[PDB]
Amino acid sequence: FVPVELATTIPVEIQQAQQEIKLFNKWSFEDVEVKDASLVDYIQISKPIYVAHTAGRYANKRFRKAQCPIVERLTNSLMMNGRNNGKKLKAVRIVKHTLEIINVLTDQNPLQVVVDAIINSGPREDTTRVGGGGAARRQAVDVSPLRRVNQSIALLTIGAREAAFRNIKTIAETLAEELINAAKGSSTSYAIKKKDELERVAKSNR
Amino acid sequence: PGVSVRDVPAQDFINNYASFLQRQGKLEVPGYVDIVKTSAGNELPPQDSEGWFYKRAASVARHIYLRKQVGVGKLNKLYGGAKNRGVRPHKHVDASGSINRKVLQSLEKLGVVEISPKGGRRISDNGLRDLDRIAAATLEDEE
Amino acid sequence: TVPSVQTFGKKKSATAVAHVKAGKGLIKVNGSPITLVQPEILRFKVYEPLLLVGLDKFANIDIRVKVTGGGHVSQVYAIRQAIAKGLVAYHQKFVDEQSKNELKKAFTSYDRTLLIADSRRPEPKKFGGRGARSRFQKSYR
Amino acid sequence: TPVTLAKVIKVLGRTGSRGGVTQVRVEFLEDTTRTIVRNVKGPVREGDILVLMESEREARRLR
Amino acid sequence: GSFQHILRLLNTNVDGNINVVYALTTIRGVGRRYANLVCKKADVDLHKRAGELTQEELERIVQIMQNPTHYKIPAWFLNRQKDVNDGKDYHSLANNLESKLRDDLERLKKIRSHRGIRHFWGLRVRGQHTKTTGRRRA
Amino acid sequence: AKHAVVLDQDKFDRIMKEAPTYRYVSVSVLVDRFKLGGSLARVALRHLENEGIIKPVSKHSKQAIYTRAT
RNA sequence: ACGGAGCCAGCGAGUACAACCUUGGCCGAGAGGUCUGGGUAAUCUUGUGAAACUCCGUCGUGCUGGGGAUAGAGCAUUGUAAUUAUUGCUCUUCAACGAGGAAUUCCUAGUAAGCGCAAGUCAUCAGCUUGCGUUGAUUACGUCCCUGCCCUUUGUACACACC
Numbered sequence: 001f002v003p004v005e006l007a008t009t010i011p012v013e014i015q016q017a018q019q020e021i022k023l024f025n026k027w028s029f030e031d032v033e034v035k036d037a038s039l040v041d042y043i044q045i046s047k048p049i050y051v052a053h054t055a056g057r058y059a060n061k062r063f064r065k066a067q068c069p070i071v072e073r074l075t076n077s078l079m080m081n082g083r084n085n086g087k088k089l090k091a092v093r094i095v096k097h098t099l100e101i102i103n104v105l106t107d108q109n110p111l112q113v114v115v116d117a118i119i120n121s122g123p124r125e126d127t128t129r130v131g132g133g134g135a136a137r138r139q140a141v142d143v144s145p146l147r148r149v150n151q152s153i154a155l156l157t158i159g160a161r162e163a164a165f166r167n168i169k170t171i172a173e174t175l176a177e178e179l180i181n182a183a184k185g186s187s188t189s190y191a192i193k194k195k196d197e198l199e200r201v202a203k204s205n206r
Numbered sequence: 207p208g209v210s211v212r213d214v215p216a217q218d219f220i221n222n223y224a225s226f227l228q229r230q231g232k233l234e235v236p237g238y239v240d241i242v243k244t245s246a247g248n249e250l251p252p253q254d255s256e257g258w259f260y261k262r263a264a265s266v267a268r269h270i271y272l273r274k275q276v277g278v279g280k281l282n283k284l285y286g287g288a289k290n291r292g293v294r295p296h297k298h299v300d301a302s303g304s305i306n307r308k309v310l311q312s313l314e315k316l317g318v319v320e321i322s323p324k325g326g327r328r329i330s331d332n333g334l335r336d337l338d339r340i341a342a343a344t345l346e347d348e349e
Numbered sequence: 350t351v352p353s354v355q356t357f358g359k360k361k362s363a364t365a366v367a368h369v370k371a372g373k374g375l376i377k378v379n380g381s382p383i384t385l386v387q388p389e390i391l392r393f394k395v396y397e398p399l400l401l402v403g404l405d406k407f408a409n410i411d412i413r414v415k416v417t418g419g420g421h422v423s424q425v426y427a428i429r430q431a432i433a434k435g436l437v438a439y440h441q442k443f444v445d446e447q448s449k450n451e452l453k454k455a456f457t458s459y460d461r462t463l464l465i466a467d468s469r470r471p472e473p474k475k476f477g478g479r480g481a482r483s484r485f486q487k488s489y490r
Numbered sequence: 491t492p493v494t495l496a497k498v499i500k501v502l503g504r505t506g507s508r509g510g511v512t513q514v515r516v517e518f519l520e521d522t523t524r525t526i527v528r529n530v531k532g533p534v535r536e537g538d539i540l541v542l543m544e545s546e547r548e549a550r551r552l553r
Numbered sequence: 554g555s556f557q558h559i560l561r562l563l564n565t566n567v568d569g570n571i572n573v574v575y576a577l578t579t580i581r582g583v584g585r586r587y588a589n590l591v592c593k594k595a596d597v598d599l600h601k602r603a604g605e606l607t608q609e610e611l612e613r614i615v616q617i618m619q620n621p622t623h624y625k626i627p628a629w630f631l632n633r634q635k636d637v638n639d640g641k642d643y644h645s646l647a648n649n650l651e652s653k654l655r656d657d658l659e660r661l662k663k664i665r666s667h668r669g670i671r672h673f674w675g676l677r678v679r680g681q682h683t684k685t686t687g688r689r690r691a
Numbered sequence: 692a693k694h695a696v697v698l699d700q701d702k703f704d705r706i707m708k709e710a711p712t713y714r715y716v717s718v719s720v721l722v723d724r725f726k727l728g729g730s731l732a733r734v735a736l737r738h739l740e741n742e743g744i745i746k747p748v749s750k751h752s753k754q755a756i757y758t759r760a761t
Numbered sequence: 762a763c764g765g766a767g768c769c770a771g772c773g774a775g776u777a778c779a780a781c782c783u784u785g786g787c788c789g790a791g792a793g794g795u796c797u798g799g800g801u802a803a804u805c806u807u808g809u810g811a812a813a814c815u816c817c818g819u820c821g822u823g824c825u826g827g828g829g830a831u832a833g834a835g836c837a838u839u840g841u842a843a844u845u846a847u848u849g850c851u852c853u854u855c856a857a858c859g860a861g862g863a864a865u866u867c868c869u870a871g872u873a874a875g876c877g878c879a880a881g882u883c884a885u886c887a888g889c890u891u892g893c894g895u896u897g898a899u900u901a902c903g904u905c906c907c908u909g910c911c912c913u914u915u916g917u918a919c920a921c922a923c924c
Contacts, residue, residue, distance in 0.1 A: 056870095056897095057870095058870095059869085059870065059898095059899095059900085059902095060870080061902090062901095062902055065900095075898095076897095076898055076899070077898085077899070079897085079898050079899075080898080080899070082874060082875065083875075084875085085873080085874040085875050085896090085897080085898070086813090086814095086874070086875055086876085086895095086896040086897045086898075087813085087814075087875080087896060087897085088896080088897070088898085089814070089815070089896085090814085131906055150899085150900080153899095154899075165822095165859095165860090166822045166859075167822060168821070168822065
């Protein structure tokens with residue numbers, strides 16, 4: 001509403017976004033409830049930010065990894081392997097292409113599929129290797145709360161990059177499929193299988 | 207208004223300039239076209255083949271406009287890039303001198319480049335006209 | 350005669366100087382307008398000072414920047430810190446404070462440095478190792 | 491998969507023979523005022539919620 | 554479609570489909586930048602698969618392969634130059650080249666030099682340190 | 692070589708049959724059916740952008756997403 | 762990866778009694794030839810417009826256009842001298858290796874790991890070391906389980922002292 005006139009000429013499509021709605025890139029960042037107690041507060045959609053490439057004074061105190069928006073978590077996780085160490089420009093371009101796939105598939109806000117994928121690839125129980133003499137008996141210890149989020153985002157990118165190792169199906173297509181499978185719990189994607197296969201190990205030693 | 211070269215994007219500027227030259231075909235050709243490596247380190251020749259030189263000559267002209275006076279050795283260093291020197295780290299060395307020199311020699315006779323004092327090559331009066339006309343043409347393409 | 354305050358931002362060695370004036374509404378970067386920049390994906394970052402407070406503020410103020418130092422992406426922060434200060438310097442001197450205070454507290458909620466200069470500079474590489482902390486590989490065989 | 495709800499009420503130091511385990515007392519959100527001691531692997535803060543399959547059984551210091 | 558797959562050229566194999574240059578690289582003599590130089594004279598698309606070609610293009614190319622100085626080559630994109638007493642240059646790009654090198658290697662063995670002595674035993678010729686390199690030998 | 696790269700006129704009939712009405716259309720999608728492998732799929736997709744048919748979303752080399760024209 | 766197009770740093774260094782760094786102009790497909798300078802150095806090389814990167818095209822999952830080792834012929838340069846390829850360049854030769862077994866080293870933020878640049882030795886030779894700036898994570902923010910270090914309390918037939 002009301003395209004403002006300056007000496008420099010900006011397109012109208014950019015000014016359509018301005019003033020009214022504080023959007024992400026084009027579509028809306030608003031809504032997208034988590035609805036899973038444990039991951040509430042740590043997964044943050046309330047922070048509205050446009051571009052996923054900030055300065056970052058995150059890892060300093062202790063619990064400041066929570067402050068970072070979940071779109072920037074996916075960008076940093078793809079940087080593994082020494083060939084791809086650094087270079088967030090390459091990751092940030094790919095993360096835009098993953099979200100464009102989800103917008104096409106059955107409409108939908110793509111962050112609702114991303115947040116639901118984080119819920120459905122976070123283990124409930126992960127055993128710590130206790131000694132007690134020498135042997136590797138595994139006692140059932142519980143998992144909360146950043147450890148459910150930090151493992152889940154890592155397991156998606158491991159399943160994503162391994163699928164596109166010598167393949168035409170380049171990272172953006174595979175990563176989009178992993179989030180749909182986790183959001184719509186299909187028991188096929190390795191984000192779910194690697195989580196489910198640890199469930200499971202705790203109950204045997206209980 | 208304020209019709210200048212900087213309103214037009216740098217990558218999109220050369221596309222209108224390349225087609226402008228190929229209509230006339232009066233920028234001149236040296237003789238080394240497509241018998242060429244392009245740089246001192248570059249395995250494959252030019253993929254463009256036809257045209258090619260008109261893309262190069264356009265990008266040389268616009269850089270002579272912005273700066274005071276550009277030379278041959280600096281243009282080779284600017285266009286030139288990385289290598290693969292066996293099983294060692296990748297170095298940087300200059301590009302082809304014979305291609306970039308005959309751009310500057312041929313553009314003098316066409317009516318763009320001028321001989322400057324001290325050292326290098328600055329712009330003529332008629333050279334600024336053709337730069338702005340194509341910039342104005344590219345402004346019409348966008349708007 | 351015209352109101353001129355020389356604002357400047359800084360991220361690493363990448364420095365930028367925004368000379369503001371009164372007029373029509375120029376926000377140029379190295380001669381070209383705001384919409385170039387040249388990293389191309391990071392064009393959206395340079396709008397962040399504009400789109401938060403609004404384009405209505407820039408209808409009077411005329412800015413132009415010369416950026417040197419650093420790299421490609423580091424220079425975008427230098428421009429963004431310069432334009433953010435460019436408004437505040439104008440609104441502090443020749444405008445009421447309540448407008449300028451609304452700029453301050455707007456940028457706190459979306460604080461990606463903006464007004465504050467960033468802390469991190471590079472640290473020396475000391476002897477015996479491929480870096481500052483990283484040491485060479487040992488062997489006692 | 492029986493999902494029992496929970497909530498942190500007290501952090502009990504940093505236990506274990508190794509550094510990678512933390513004891514916690516756990517009160518429930520539904521059916522309040524039922525205190526049980528049980529281990530947590532990751533970071534813990536007052537007011538956090540725990541997800542767990544097996545709830546009523548009790549854990550001890552890991553050796 | 555599917556017009557011919559092998560498809561010989563001076564006895565050696567030229568596999569169907571693929572490309573102009575990278576099918577021609579199968580010849581024991583032609584490489585990844587010579588076939589582009591040869592294709593430039595005839596003026597054919599590198600975009601095409603090239604195994605499915607017109608009949609005249611094969612025979613036009615073979616004339617350029619045999620004769621270097623006649624067709625448009627600078628005379629310094631050649632494999633071999635200078636042989637016998639005082640005169641001229643020439644090269645080959647077929648089973649001629651592999652046979653030529655064996656005869657040219659015998660010249661080094663006949664004169665009996667530091668290279669020719671090293672070629673007898675199968676050791677490293679170009680001043681390398683043989684305290685590591687190639688733990689197998691031949 | 693795992694086949695499906697050689698140019699056949701019989702296949703060019705079936706490309707236009709299976710062109711319209713699809714969610715996913717890209718270089719990533721067509722190779723899964725064992726069609727024109729690799730680069731010839733890009734040339735096949737370049738035909739379908741000329742006379743309408745299928746309209747674009749992304750316009751990058753290596754990331755070329757398209758969607759059907761509603 | 763292979764093409765164009767876009768195009769940004771900081772540490773340094775540098776001859777007049779020697780032969781140093783050397784823009785600009787012509788010759789050359791390269792390397793390098795030559796005419797000229799300027800600089801005893803925030804003045805000239807130099808903005809040391811360096812790489813990785815950005816963005817459209819060419820190839821696409823085949824030891825392949827990935828990878829570059831072995832090889833042969835000639836064209837350059839530094840030297841009294843390069844055959845025991847000094848060094849670079851030009852076409853050809855086109856292998857080994859589809860993410861590495863027990864083991865094992867370094868590492869808590871502008872760091873790690875990509876990335877080149879400069880100096881040091883230097884008539885001519887970086888796959889090295891010491892320095893600089895670009896690209897910039899994941900993961901602890903605790904513990905004596907392992908490998909060794911400091912004290913106290915205990916035992917000694919040891920005192921060139923558990924070899």
